[PDB]
């Protein structure tokens, strides 16, 4: 009725969708961004890729959408679908690995005045720093910049909307844990050109990694091996009868250490941990190495151990006596006096190396835990 | 200012698929350039890569220089993809995957008819890295790209620095490194005998890699391994009799470990590229380790066995003594360890040589290409 | 004829494609939603991912499509492609982990006075909380919330069929699991203005009994060699060395087992239960075999004149046999017996315990099938 | 020109012909539609999850009464082409195997006969969830059932009436195609109050199993078995190889364990039955048991596991005395038990070894029955 | 000017592309096709997949494209957009694993006459036999047929154009090498139907495969494992005192190669070959087993080598004489003589079955080499 058909048709005719609500040569189209990650689905620190939930709150005004009693008078605020709207080519700077998912053909709301919001339920593919400094106990801050993609601060400008945590909807299924995250605004003008360039939202993800299951399995076969090597020390000094017997273990255990290496480097390759983490294992594991080789070479270190009728009796007794000598010689080879030395020599070494391994372990755990 | 009429005027005559060619005998002036921003996948064994390229596209078409209502209004216009001549880009030698987000994006029409456009593109390509690129001397990645549509007698591409870079935004998480990026603008005439040249864009990228992490995983094990065998070698002189087999247990253990290595890193080179030089020293320094190793058992294999009524009976018993003595004597002339002791120093210096031959040469294959 | 061209015409003349079968802001169009499941194909019980297939039976009324003589009274039922009605761009609050396949753009069944029937089968990528709690016999339940991803319940009401319909209605016979019931409850969380999603409960039971069987054999068969290594001492004391061979062997075996367990839960993990205590059972055989190994170690050794010669002979032999007789006093077999029966207590106690826990685990936490 | 411009203007396919309207001569019984199924190839089989990716020639036929042409259409050329959007195309749904939308068997070029009859038949790369069940492994290897037809239309808007499966069975499959029957039908159901959509029901009864796993897998068993078999022959020839004999247990043991490990791996990739999987692991356990037996049986026994006259009598004393020790050991030796052991190892190996291929047969006979 | 608008307008009205330039009831549409293959980026011998590029040189004629001074006169040869063309659904009969890529949206060659060509740089994935007989030394010829998809002879016809090799641009980085490539034409009518069916181009790729990597490592462990077997035989002569030691190396050996066959199955099923090959390794190596079977069984083959004062002097030397003839007994069995026949018996037999392995191996390559 009330100019019913005349209302609706007029609107279609003189209105070009593609036109950008440019208002004189100035303020650019003022458009603000506001991301609220509802939640995260999955991440790969190794490949620094994340699939996340984002509701993008996009705001801007088109004074061409203002109305009178025949549009606003009809029903204050209403639902108009996107299409007709000029969609900022939003883009995560050093990220952007994937298209915005569910950004397309959604709707928006127009007020009696004009103000419009476009907030389609997104979830997409991301790309943020993790560097080999993300899995640390001391984390790294995922630097993520967002802003207008192909338009300049003269044609348009993307601005921020508010502060909010990243652990606000951080995934509890993540193999990592959050410290804090902040985001502040910025305008990037380049010494290149004397012009005034796009605006941007810079995310900073500060989170520290490593789920604790890993922790237990690995350090215990170490104190495990510690005891066998501990036995590697005590077994010899309290019984050199199974030196070779332990030859076996030395084989079974470094190979155990070798195969643990396949498993945890793929972990290494599975998750990017700051290499300086690797040196822990480096000297630790390798002392199992230098100690053995010496301990067991030393274990090994030892030469071979690892009237007339009366005279008959004395030529015979003399035979038993110098072989008597001989027996004592090889025993004069494998002494039990210094195998005790190596026992405390290295156990203090191990309690040193060990407590030294615990050192930096404990130390930056004095930093991380904080 | 005829703003409406002008728009409506040209659109009347506005021609889509026709190039802004003054006439037909001197082509149009097309500008292009690429700034690397992402080198996403380096599969050198197959010679392919994925990069987010800034396709800087530029050309001229005054078919739309405007008046006061559009040129003067703003010396800058952002008009839709589908609305002007568009270079369907691709890398002759590389692009093996149609560009992604490299097209259908907002272009730029200044006021005099200058056209600027720059979409980001993730796409696949195939540069060199043909049984080389793993050295210390690097194979220059040569990618030439051009429109795959028309040929230079109508289209002409331009470029700039051919001296200045790929490391401009070369990824920091790459297992490699770049040292120079040269680029030339050229005509079309290849080995295949094609004429009517369509100019293209050459992309040199001589880059370095090899930042070994596996190096000392390889270097300490071998020393531990060498020592282990040198244990096998010197440990015998120290070791008891129950050690011949002791030594054997090590061979078993030594190569269990060995081919396990042979299975580990061979995998390495198949998932990534390949090259034989570094490969030669390992397996053959490895085969020599094995060689003198089994040689050792063949050495701890070599040697023959070390692998009145009163007096008549006193006579004969004094014989078992001298008799068996002749026997234990056997042991003597058999196990007088000239070969073994010397075998230690045999492998020792041979060890030093194999090592020197190798690490000295590794010194060279890092020092010539240094 | 009866105004056929007329009706026909007017309809397509006035009919609106993109409009909602309701009049203004009110009770809206009461759409019927009800899916007869086909079957399910993959349960990623580990990440809580669900790919199933069912029919999207939708149905409401288009009093805008009621026909007349020929299409109404002529053929009360006629098929017509959708594309012309508001379609629940339904997403699943937890699930809907991906797009629709055979879900939208398909024909529909349109009745005479406006009823609309659309029955399309589809595959849908969902994600329900089967969490890492999809293996306890007490298992758990999940929330499957379906609903549109641009519409807010304001211009339509959603309504269900049964809530007991069950999910085993089309449970996959291919499932290594089983089901007890499927609850269906209509929801409108007030955290959003938009009345929305419907929660569907999975009181799932997944009992695939296949390899834990030969897993038992290790525990017990390994025990065979275990009880054996604990039995071998007073069986063949000389077990002394061979014993250590057993544990190398025994430990490598269990460590390889360590190898298959993490990579197998890698796709279907839940509570540790089984692993929790077999982990203890592990540690148990592990340490028991190692302290018995220390049981093995604890032994510092084990681990006239005519007549004078005679007399010197009498003393030689006797004198040292006591010495080696001393070794007897030292390595008697008291411990072996006592701890081989402490072995009796330990292994049969810790044995009948997880035996029990396991016992308690399958029967006790079984009835919460609700 | 024979009324051609005018006539195709008469048909105007899209404009004059109702493509959104199916020419079923209005509400009646149905448009006589017929489907023809010919598999062009089977590329992948997944026995474990009852899923198959296979190609089919979707041969389709129905008469388009509005398609009948005249001279400058019909007779001008008694056969011509017209795209999908200009040809009515049945909405053929792979009834129980289309849980994976059809590819390039979609909106493709169709064949236009002269008197309305039309012919559309392109290629279908599809995925299916055929009746594998855990019974698609016994020797019959079940019967894979599939139904094809025009999904949308019913018994008064469509009627589809009705080729071997091995006609294009893939030769790189790990199975064997024994038969493939084809018979159409139509059917209503309980909740529906009317009959509808007719369909192409095609059962594929197949069989599979390698003659290769048998090769390298039983191979080690008679080889390994001879080790355990020799194990008991070897306790005689030289039981003194105690430790070394022990080594072999570790070694024949580690061999045994991961051999079984490779077994489930290929297993999960294949739903293996409980009947067969036990004979494998049951018998390797037979040796596993006897390896443990090997243990004890090999280390099981408690031990085998006048002045001058005065002085030498001392020695004859020490003589005899430890001769008692020496012998306390052969008491344990237990050697007249030797042959019986390895004889009662032979007998059982014969019993069980036979029991298996005995059972092999007792189930090998009835299928061949 | 020159009938400017009149010439391009008339062309669009009475011109059609759906249609094919059918010329009377005869030879079909004269289609000229050919392969111009210049790169083979990826292929897998195992899955017999090939993703290469071949510009589809098509050549045929359409009189309707003939012109006068107002199109020919304009500029002799003019290139029209492909759209105007009826494009055949060409496809790889037993291949076609992938869409041709880069053919759409391209340029078409038109002549004053009508001649036309369009060589598209088509890249696509293929599927042709390689079977297990792909990579031998004697090759297989992959049968690749190509021709119209859904069109029968009564409407379109294609024919070869020229012979060109496959090695003309074959991959020098291929794990294979070519010998010859032939392509002849034909038309296939089927006994089924009395009709005259499609035409097609059948390519046959004749080329031998297999790098030598797998080769070097199959034979190294073989000779090396034959060294330990050789040791196997020689040791009992030079160190039979380590027969058990021998046992250890057989557990060693055995596990190693049993593990070698693990690699085989992975590699072989990971890279295709005709089974007839592994047959070589099969018995040859079961031979080391069959032989160690007998040889060490034989090695362990042997029972256990695997006055009155004057009186006791006699009871005593008696004690000694009894045992002495007894020790003679165990040596009575280890005669050190048959040990030399067994290594020589088998050394020759392995030198012979090795030479046998060597035989068919070299015979087969005296066949390949050809």
Chart the SSEs and their pairings.
The complex is a heteropentamer, with 2 copies of chain A (about 375 residues), 1 copy of chain B (about 375 residues), 1 copy of chain C (about 375 residues) and 1 copy of chain D (about 375 residues).
Chain B: H1 3-13, E1 30-43, E2 48-60, E3 89-91, E4 108-109, E5 114-117, E6 120-125, E7 143-147, E8 157-158, E9 176-180, E10 185-186, E11 200-203, E12 206-209, H2 215-238, H3 244-271, H4 277-299, H5 309-334, H6 338-367
Parallel strand pairs in B: 1-8
Antiparallel strand pairs in B: 1-2, 2-5, 2-6, 3-7, 4-5, 7-11, 9-12, 10-11
Helix pairs in contact in B: 2-3, 2-6, 3-4, 4-6
Chain C: H1 4-14, E1 30-34, E2 37-44, E3 49-55, E4 57-59, E5 77-81, E6 90-92, E7 100-101, E8 107-111, E9 116-117, E10 121-126, E11 143-148, E12 157-159, E13 178-179, E14 184-186, E15 198-201, E16 204-205, H2 212-231, H3 239-265, H4 273-297, H5 305-330, H6 334-340, H7 342-362
Parallel strand pairs in C: 1-12
Antiparallel strand pairs in C: 1-4, 2-3, 3-10, 5-8, 6-11, 7-10, 8-9, 11-15, 13-16, 14-15
Helix pairs in contact in C: 2-3, 2-4, 3-4, 4-7
Chain D: H1 4-11, E1 32-46, E2 51-63, H2 71-75, E3 80-82, E4 92-94, E5 110-112, E6 117-120, E7 123-128, E8 144-150, E9 159-161, E10 175-179, E11 182-186, E12 198-208, H3 213-238, H4 242-268, H5 274-299, H6 307-333, H7 338-364
Parallel strand pairs in D: 1-9
Antiparallel strand pairs in D: 1-2, 2-6, 2-7, 3-5, 4-8, 5-6, 8-12, 10-12, 11-12
Helix pairs in contact in D: 3-5, 3-7, 4-5
């Amino acid at each position: 009725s009330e100019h019913e058909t005349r209302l609706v048709a007029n609107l279609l005719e003189n209105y070009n969708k593609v036109i950008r609500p440019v208002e004189h040569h100035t303020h650019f189209v003022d458009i603000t961004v506001g991301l609220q990650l509802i939640q995260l689905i999955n991440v790969d620190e190794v490949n620094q890729i994340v699939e996340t939930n984002v509701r993008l709150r996009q705001q801007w005004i088109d004074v061409r959408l203002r109305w009178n009693p025949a549009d606003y008078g009809g029903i204050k605020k209403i639902r108009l679908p996107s299409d007709d709207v000029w969609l900022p080519d939003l883009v995560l700077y050093n990220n952007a690995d994937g298209d915005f998912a569910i950004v397309h053909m959604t709707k928006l709301l127009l007020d009696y005045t004009g103000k419009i919001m476009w907030t389609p339920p997104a979830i997409f593919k991301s790309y943020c720093e993790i560097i080999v400094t993300h899995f640390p106990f001391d984390q790294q801050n995922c630097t993520m910049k967002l802003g207008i993609w192909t338009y300049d601060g003269t044609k348009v400008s993307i601005s921020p909307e508010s502060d909010r945590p990243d652990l606000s909807t951080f995934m509890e299924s993540g193999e990592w844990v959050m410290k804090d995250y902040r985001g502040w605004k910025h305008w990037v003008y380049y010494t290149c050109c004397p012009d005034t360039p796009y605006l941007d939202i810079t995310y900073h993800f500060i989170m520290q990694r490593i789920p604790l299951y890993f922790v237990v399995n690995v350090i215990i076969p170490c104190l495990l091996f510690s005891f066998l090597t501990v036995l590697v020390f005590y077994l010899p000094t309290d019984s050199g009868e199974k030196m070779t017997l332990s030859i076996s273990v030395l084989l079974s255990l470094t190979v155990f250490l070798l195969v643990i290496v396949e498993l945890i480097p793929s972990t290494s390759s599975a998750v990017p941990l700051i290499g300086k983490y690797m040196l822990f294992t480096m000297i630790f594991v390798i002392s199992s190495i230098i100690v053995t080789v010496v301990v067991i070479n030393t274990h090994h270190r030892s030469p071979s151990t690892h009237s007339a009728i009366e005279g008959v009796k004395y030529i015979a007794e003399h035979m038993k006596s110098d072989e008597e000598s001989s027996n004592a010689a090889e025993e004069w080879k494998y002494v039990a006096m210094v195998i005790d030395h190596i026992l405390l020599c290295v156990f203090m070494l191990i309690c040193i190396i060990g407590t030294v391994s615990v050192f930096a372990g404990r130390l930056i755990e004095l930093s991380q835990e904080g | 200012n005829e703003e409406g009429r002008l728009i409506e005027k040209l659109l009347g005559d506005y021609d889509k698929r026709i190039k802004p060619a003054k006439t037909l005998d001197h082509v149009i002036d097309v500008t292009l350039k690429l700034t690397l921003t992402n080198l996403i996948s380096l599969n050198e064994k197959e010679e392919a890569l994925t990069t987010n390229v800034w396709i800087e596209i530029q050309w001229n078409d005054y078919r739309l220089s405007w008046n006061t209502s559009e040129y003067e209004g703003i010396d800058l216009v952002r008009i839709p993809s589908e609305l002007l001549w568009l270079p369907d880009v691709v890398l002759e030698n590389n692009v093996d995957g149609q560009f992604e987000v490299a097209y259908y994006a907002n272009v730029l029409v200044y006021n005099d008819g200058s056209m600027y456009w720059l979409p980001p593109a993730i796409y696949r390509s195939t540069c060199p890295i043909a049984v080389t690129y793993f050295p210390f001397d690097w194979q220059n990645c040569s990618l030439v790209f051009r429109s795959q549509t028309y040929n230079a007698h109508e289209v002409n591409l331009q470029l700039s620095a051919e001296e200045g870079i790929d490391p401009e935004d070369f990824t920091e998480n790459g297992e490699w490194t770049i040292r120079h990026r040269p680029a030339k603008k050229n005509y079309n005439w290849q080995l295949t005998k094609d004429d009517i040249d369509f100019q293209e864009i050459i992309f040199f990228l001589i880059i370095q890699r090899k930042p070994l992490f596996y190096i000392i995983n390889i270097i300490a094990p071998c020393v531990l391994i060498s020592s282990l065998v040198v244990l096998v070698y010197f440990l015998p002189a120290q070791a008891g009799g129950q050690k011949c087999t002791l030594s054997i247990s090590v061979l078993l253990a030594q190569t269990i470990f060995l081919f396990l290595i042979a299975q580990k890193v061979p995998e390495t080179s198949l998932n990534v590229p390949l090259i034989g030089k570094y490969l030669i020293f390992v397996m053959f320094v490895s085969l020599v380790i094995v060689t003198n190793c089994v040689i050792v058992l063949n050495v701890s294999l070599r040697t023959p066995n070390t692998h009145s009524c009163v007096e008549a009976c006193n006579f004969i018993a004094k014989s078992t003594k001298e008799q068996n003595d002749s026997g234990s004597e056997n042991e003597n002339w058999v196990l007088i360890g000239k070969v073994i002791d010397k075998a230690c120093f045999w492998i020792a210096l041979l060890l030093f040589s194999l090592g020197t031959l190798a690490i000295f040469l590794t010194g060279h294959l890092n020092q010539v290409p240094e | 004829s009866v105004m056929e061209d007329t009706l026909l015409s007017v309809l397509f003349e006035n009919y609106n494609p993109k409009v909602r079968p309701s009049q203004t802001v009110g009770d809206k169009v009461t759409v019927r939603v009800g899916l007869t499941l086909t079957s399910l194909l993959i349960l990623n019980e580990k990440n809580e991912e669900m790919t199933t297939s069912v029919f999207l039976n939708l149905a409401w009324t288009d009093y805008r499509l009621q026909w007349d003589p020929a299409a109404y009274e002529g053929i009360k039922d006629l098929s017509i492609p959708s594309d012309d009605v508001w379609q629940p761009d339904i997403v699943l609050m937890n699930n809907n982990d991906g797009s629709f396949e055979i879900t939208l753009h398909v024909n529909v069944l349109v009745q005479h006075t406006g009823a609309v029937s659309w029955h399309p089968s589809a595959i849908y990528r969902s994600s329900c909380t089967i969490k890492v709690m999809y293996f306890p016999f007490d298992w758990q339940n999940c929330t499957m919330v379906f609903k549109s991803y641009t519409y807010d319940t304001s211009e339509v009401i959603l309504q269900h069929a049964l809530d007991a319909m069950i999910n085993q209605d089309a449970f996959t016979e291919n499932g290594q699991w089983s089901i007890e019931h499927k609850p269906s409850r209509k929801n409108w969380r007030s955290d959003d203005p938009s009345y929305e999603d419907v929660t569907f409960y999975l009181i799932i039971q997944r009992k695939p009994l296949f390899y834990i069987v030969y897993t038992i054999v290790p525990c017990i068969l390994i025990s065979i060699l275990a009880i054996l290594v604990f039995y071998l001492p007073p069986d063949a004391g000389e077990k002394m060395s061979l014993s250590i061979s057993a544990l190398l062997a025994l430990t490598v075996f269990l460590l390889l087992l360590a190898d298959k367990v993490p990579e197998t839960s890698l796709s279907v993990p839940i509570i540790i239960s089984y692993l929790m205590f077999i982990m203890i059972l592990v540690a148990f055989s592990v340490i028991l075999s190692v302290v018995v190994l220390n049981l093995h170690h604890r032994s510092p050794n084990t681990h006239e004149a005519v007549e004078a010669i005679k007399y010197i002979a009498e003393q030689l032999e006797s004198a040292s046999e006591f010495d080696d007789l001393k070794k007897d006093w030292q390595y008697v077999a008291m411990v072996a017996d006592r701890l081989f029966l402490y072995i009796f207590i330990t292994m049969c106690s810790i044995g009948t315990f997880s035996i029990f826990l396991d016992a308690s685990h399958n029967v006790p936490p079984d009835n919460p099938f609700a | 020109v024979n009324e051609e411009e005018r006539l195709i203007n008469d048909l105007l396919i899209v404009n004059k012909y109702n493509k959104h309207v199916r020419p079923v001569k209005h509400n009646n019984e149905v448009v006589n539609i017929a489907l023809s199924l010919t598999l062009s190839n089977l590329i992948s089989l997944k026995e474990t999850d009852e899923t198959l990716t296979t190609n089919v020639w979707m041969d389709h036929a129905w008469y388009d009464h509005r398609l009948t042409w005249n001279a400058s259409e019909y007779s001008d050329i008694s056969i011509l082409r017209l795209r999908p959007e200009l040809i009515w195309i049945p909405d053929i749904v792979l009834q129980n195997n289309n849980d994976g939308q059809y590819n390039v068997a979609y909106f493709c070029n169709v064949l236009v006969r002269p008197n309305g009859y039309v012919t559309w038949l392109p290629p279908a790369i599809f995925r299916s969830s055929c009746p594998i069940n855990v019974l698609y492994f016994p020797f019959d290897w079940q019967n894979c059932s599939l139904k094809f037809t025009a999904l949308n239309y019913n018994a008064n808007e469509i009627s589809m009436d009705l080729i071997i499966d091995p006609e294009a069975f893939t030769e790189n499959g790990e199975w064997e195609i024994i038969h493939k029957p084809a018979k159409k039908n139509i059917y209503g159901d309980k909740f529906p109050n009317g009959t509808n959509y007719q369909d192409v029901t095609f059962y594929l009864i197949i069989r599979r199993k390698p003659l290769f796993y048998v090769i390298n897998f039983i191979t080690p068993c008679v080889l390994i078995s001879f080790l355990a078999a020799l194990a008991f022959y070897l306790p005689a020839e030289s039981g003194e190889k105690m430790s070394t004999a022990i080594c072999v247990l570790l070694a024949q043991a580690v061999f045994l364990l991961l051999t079984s490990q490779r077994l489930p791996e290929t297993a999960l990739a294949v739903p293996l039955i409980g009947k067969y999987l036990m004979f494998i692991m049951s018998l390797v356990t037979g040796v596993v048991v006897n390896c443990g037996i090997v243990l004890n049986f090999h280390f099981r026994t408690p031990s085998t596991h006048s002045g001058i006259d005065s002085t030498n009598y001392i020695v004859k004393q020490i003589k005899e005395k430890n001769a008692y020790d020496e012998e306390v050991g052969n008491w344990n030796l237990v050697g007249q038990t030797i042959d019986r052991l390895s004889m009662f190892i032979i007998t059982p190996v014969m019993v069980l070894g036979t029991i298996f291929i005995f059972v092999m047969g007792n189930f090998n006979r009835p299928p061949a029955k």
